[PDB]
Design a protein around this ligand. Structure first.
Ligand SMILES: [Ca+2]
Ligand SMILES: [Ca+2]
Ligand SMILES: [Ca+2]
Ligand SMILES: [Ca+2]
Lengths: 291, 321, 321, 291
């Protein structure tokens, strides 16, 4: 074929972390939706996404996840990587469930292991992992568990792959538009799911970051004066900041380097209703310079 | 390669051992009369607490460390297949312990097996030694206990169907004494079973009932939960098999309501209760760990309680209130 | 031997045919990647009523005549094994009709198959003919319909998991027109499936929920029961799969109680109810037949109902009141 | 061995009957207890029982049940014989369950079929089928179903076998003693379970017959005058009768030829409490001759 491009690459999935005396599947993230293998999924494929945004279909030829320890040799416990063909089945809750997965790999946190998921031969659609039936669009589900260890960053998980992409299309949006109201509850999202919305009160706005990296965020909302209370309730660094706030109208832009699964908080709000997030991925020299 | 300032015959201690476990697909084949399954399942994590002679973690050796298969704790995956058959015979049966812990750890872990399905505990470290089928190691090491398999078909059944000595092969058990207070290793089981006589599927739900005043409690079905406190003020059930359940609990108090909680490890995902008069009912979608408790507290004049537990996924949520 | 006053080439009508069916043990074997099961299970009895064009007995062609396996109605025994796997592929699949009735009987029985898992009904006898996979016979005769098996893995799933065209192979169905009003024959299925990708066991319970006011009803798990009437005065559930269940039903009325009954074939073995305020709960141990109803009548201002059904045996009786 | 006697024989199990438009397992009898294969079970082995009463242990070498039609060739429907190794598992409720039994045999009611249950090699105890763990004492369970047919006696079920019996013992009672009270509810039974007790009121006494054949019954109880109301609420014939009734003390002896699963009723009772049944098996020329 010759509308067919083929890519081989190794990129960054996520950091595998554990908490002391807990099971902790997928870093405690939960909703086994953003761990579907479509690619397109900027959590699993943060580098492939800029390419796959330009195509309609994908087929993996080889796909392998790799754990490389960040932790030292005296560390106790166990990490585990698993893969289910059903991208929609729920995760493992206990260790007993974890062990029945056909495609499983477990090793002590200071060692290296890897998991080779099996690829089939079918073209599927590159889409949102929320844009229709999971079983039709996703090869399957990926996930990890870390138990009986300490409470720390245990390792880096990489993914190495060879995909075919097919059918060039106009680019899917490589940015995020996340809208909310007040007065309602509707929370329409458009573009990649970089950030998620935890709560939209009238006092506080909290956006949790599902995707590690450096961004430029634009947040805009309706309050009644106040505003200036930005902080990172996780591991991150507001490298550049601009704020402006008056009546029923305020706006915040910033060059955060969020990571793992950190947090973005607008605290001193007062009488807030509508709000919208705009996320794009950038470096740091994309730094805001007006105050 | 190559170790400093050493003569041969030295034994050199590493600081930690990594053993790597990969997923294992099950093998089926029919021995003309029997279906034969080979697979590896996860028994339990093995923990000890400091300064205790910790036997079977908390728990103690009861009737779900009995080998039959049909035993959700010992054979989570196999249970479903076994329900479709009437009798079984183990061919090979090995328990394997994979260390979770580094070699500065110290203490003892031990695996034992006894043919008396309802053999009581080893009472202390000295008794523990007298078993014929015993493996004792340092917690940072790997080991395995091979269970002697005899050559007799016994019925596939939950432990509530007459003499356990008739249906169960024996009893598995572990102990951790001395040593720290931590999760020391994984305990896997490797097995090859023959299943005989296909039949219509046995039910896999639990029905645990108590009265009050008669004092006796009766269980049918699998031992997912156990009843720990009777009382008229409290009802506590204990998880014996980790997982997500849709539990239905019905009982006779005198008016008042109930206060549900999960002491220990676990979360409630979807509650619903209706409590009055001399009748109350509580149905919930819980995820729970081994040895955690589901307590119904704040009861008032409660007699007669019954529990219905079935395995579900978290998303089988109760939707009314 | 030897028939009176006959020339050869004659065809001689007997008065009845006896075909004898014996029990069939299942065969397992692993095709290196897949486990392969061959077995024969009982689909349903095939009845007609007089002067009706009776399609799928009462019922009508819905989403549990869909082939997937994982389908309690079509594969009672297989369900349990299938729950332990992620995808399937049928190798051979035959439906077989064994006459229950003598040759003075008359009328037509017909078996059909359609790839559209959610193909609607054949509307009349003429439409019924247009199927490509059809078998039409006199009711006193024997026949079998062979379903074309393709060569693609599809997911093992209950019919409540996205497009049924993705997970189900096709749809089975039967019709009986003209003829008397009686039970005409047995319908067996012979199959060989390959199951792939072992996984932790899928839940086999049912969770059927409705609101009221939103009008929509949602099902998770197997289709043992179906919701037929909403109402604020009545709640009726219908058995789609014959057997004994422990059903838990919870809903929101405004005070009053409930009046349970089993219209159609079935018996209640152990009731318990608590009904007040804006919350009621009814748990029971019922044995029920295909197309019978479990009705909660005498309701008063009832919105929001949820059902939990699991297979049990009669002896899993509710013990409180 | 030479405390070992070996018997080969073919005797009468029961009549297989159906009711129109019903499933009807075991003639509607129910409690799958008196269908356990021990022998000793006077329902399955009415001829072997007189022998096995004299021994402690049994092993079957071959065992086969046989259905011979009583019904004609135009009869519709289907009979089925099944066998479970677990004498304690409940019967089949629907046809779907019936079909999953490994040892099953079904044929149209006007034809002959048979079922060969598989014998193992273990000695078990000859006992009550209520005298301890079913799985330890019974080879298994037998049973039959008749569906989609008419409402009639469809056929005779016979059993053909070869047993070894071991260990001579003093004879187990070949009679029945069934006691009841009033004032209590306790209902102690001793000997073979020929008859069962359905209700013991104060107005009526009803004994249902679990075992086809000719008997001599002695029933004795405590009322307050009255008594004389004997009848057979099934298929049977009170071939000989003696009654005597006064105050808190009455007594009935009779030579009934009960069958299938008939009934014995004492109607005109008044103020009855204690009662006891004595059943022994006899011919008819064991006829009561005093009035
Ligand atoms: Ca799955
Ligand atoms: Ca012992
Ligand atoms: Ca169609
Ligand atoms: Ca059984």
């Amino acid at each position: 074929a010759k509308g067919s491009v083929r890519i081989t690459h190794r990129e960054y999935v996520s950091v595998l972390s554990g908490t002391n005396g807990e099971f902790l599947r997928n870093n405690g993230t939960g909703p086994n939706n953003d761990f579907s293998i479509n690619p397109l999924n900027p959590f699993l494929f943060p580098w492939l996404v800029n390419i796959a945004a330009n195509f309609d279909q994908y087929k993996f030829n080889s796909l392998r996840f790799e754990y490389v320890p960040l932790v030292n040799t005296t560390t106790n416990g166990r990490v585990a990587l698993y893969f289910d063909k059903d991208s929609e089945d729920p995760g493992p809750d206990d260790r007993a469930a974890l062990a029945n997965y056909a495609h499983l790999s477990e090793i002590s946190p200071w060692a290296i292991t890897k998991l080779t998921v099996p690829t089939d031969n079918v073209k599927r659609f590159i889409s949102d992992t929320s844009s229709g039936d999971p079983k039709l669009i996703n090869l399957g589900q990926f996930g990890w568990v870390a138990y009986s260890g300490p409470t720390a960053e245990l390792g880096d998980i990489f993914v190495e792959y060879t995909v075919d992409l097919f059918e060039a299309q106009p680019t899917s949006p490589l940015l995020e538009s996340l809208f909310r109201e007040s007065a309602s509850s509707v929370q329409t999202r458009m573009g990649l799911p970089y950030f998620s919305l935890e709560v939209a009160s009238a006092t506080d706005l909290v956006w949790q970051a599902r995707v590690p990296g450096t961004y430029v965020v634009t947040i805009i909302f309706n309050s009644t004066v106040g505003g200036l209370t930005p902080s990172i309730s996780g591991g991150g660094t507001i490298n550049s900041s601009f704020s402006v706030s008056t009546a029923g109208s305020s706006a915040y832009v910033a060059n955060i380097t969020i990571r793992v699964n950190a947090n973005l908080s607008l605290s001193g709000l007062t009488g807030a209703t509508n709000a919208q997030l705009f996320a794009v991925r950038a470096i740091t020299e994309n730094a805001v310079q007006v105050v």
